Protein: pancreatic ribonuclease A
Amino acid sequence: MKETAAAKFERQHMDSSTSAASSSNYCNQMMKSRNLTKDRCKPVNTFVHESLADVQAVCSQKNVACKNGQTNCYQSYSTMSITDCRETGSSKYPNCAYKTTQANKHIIVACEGNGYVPVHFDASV
Ligand SMILES: [Cs+]
Structure:
């Protein structure tokens, strides 16, 4: 079955199963279980610990520019529980290693065609 942009966004960024990173090993486990170390060690990736509905709602909040210059990005009005994952020095494809950083920040996502479906995670602030 084809992986839609919606499904891909959920695979790469949604973890409503936990309220926050459980430990420092969180990223290593999640990056692997979500297939983010298969085609390479995805350098950076953020997981959101909120309901899909609250993240989806961001598409109708504060409109802002995306890091790439596109105009379909949106920043959340309130802060959200998120976990930042970044490849560390001891990492080396195919043996990927990550640093886990838990936090409560505002998220910014890109909504397809400026619609209401989040398809990319731009950043957290
Ligand atoms: Cs919108």
